[PDB]
């Protein structure tokens, strides 16, 4: 998911 | 004796997944102190602020990230999410669409996350 830290 | 920026980002990532968002944001802040020119630390902290409902703080960090990496997919996506929660629907949709274009250019694959976010934002603009 894009809803996450890198 | 002292943590590196990388140690601090890793600690912040662990606290984020652990649902310790203020603590994670402070870790990313310490990473920024060690290397203030890294956009990812600001976008990571912006996401913490979003989870903390601290929209003005999240928006400021997205703006900082965009100064350091104007191609950042996540800076645009999190900015759009911020603006959506602040009811700035037109700006939210523009930023989510820009995230879509940048992700395609960079060959990133988040599943249907970005189109799904766009649909959510357009429905919310219409329902309001």
Residue B36, φ and ψ in degrees, nearest 5: -80, 5
- Within 10 Å of residue B40's Cβ, how many Cβ atoms? 18
Residues B64, B37: Cα–Cα separation, whole Å: 9
Cα B51 to Cα B122: distance, rounded to the nearest angstrom: 21
Cα separation of B69 and B64, whole Å? 9
Resolution in units of Å: 1.4
B110, β-bridge pairs: B112
**Of the partner residues B43, B99, B110, the one whose CB lies closest to the CB of residue A6:** B43
Cβ–Cβ under 8 Å, residues B45 and B25: yes
Give the separation between CA B75 and CA B120, rounded to whole angstroms: 18
- Encoded tokens for B53: 């409902």
On the 0-12 / 13-18 / 19+ scale of CB atoms within 10 A, B92 is buried
- Give me B59's structure tokens: 């928006």
User: Helices marked H in B35-112 — which ranges?
Assistant: 39-51, 55-68, 73-85, 89-105
Residues of A in contact with B99 (CB under 8 A): 2
Q: How far apart are CA B51 and CA B41, in angstroms?
A: 16
Determination method here?
Answer: X-ray
Q: Pick from B86, B87, B78: which is nearest to B126 by CA?
A: B87
| B chain contacts of residue A1, beta-carbon cutoff 8 Å | 110-111, 113
């Amino acid at each position: 998911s894009i809803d996450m830290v890198d | 004796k002292s943590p590196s920026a990388q140690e601090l980002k890793e600690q912040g990532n662990r606290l984020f997944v652990g649902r310790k968002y203020p603590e994670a944001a402070a870790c990313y802040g310490r990473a920024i102190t060690r290397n203030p020119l890294v956009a990812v630390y600001y976008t990571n902290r912006a996401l913490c602020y979003l989870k903390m409902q601290q929209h003005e703080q999240a928006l400021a960090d997205c703006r900082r990230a965009l100064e350091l990496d104007g191609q950042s997919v996540k800076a645009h996506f999190f900015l759009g999410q911020c603006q959506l929660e602040m009811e700035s629907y037109d700006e939210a949709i523009a930023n989510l669409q820009r995230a879509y274009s940048l992700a395609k250019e960079q060959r990133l694959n988040f599943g249907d996350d970005i189109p799904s976010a766009l649909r959510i934002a357009k429905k919310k603009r219409w329902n309001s």
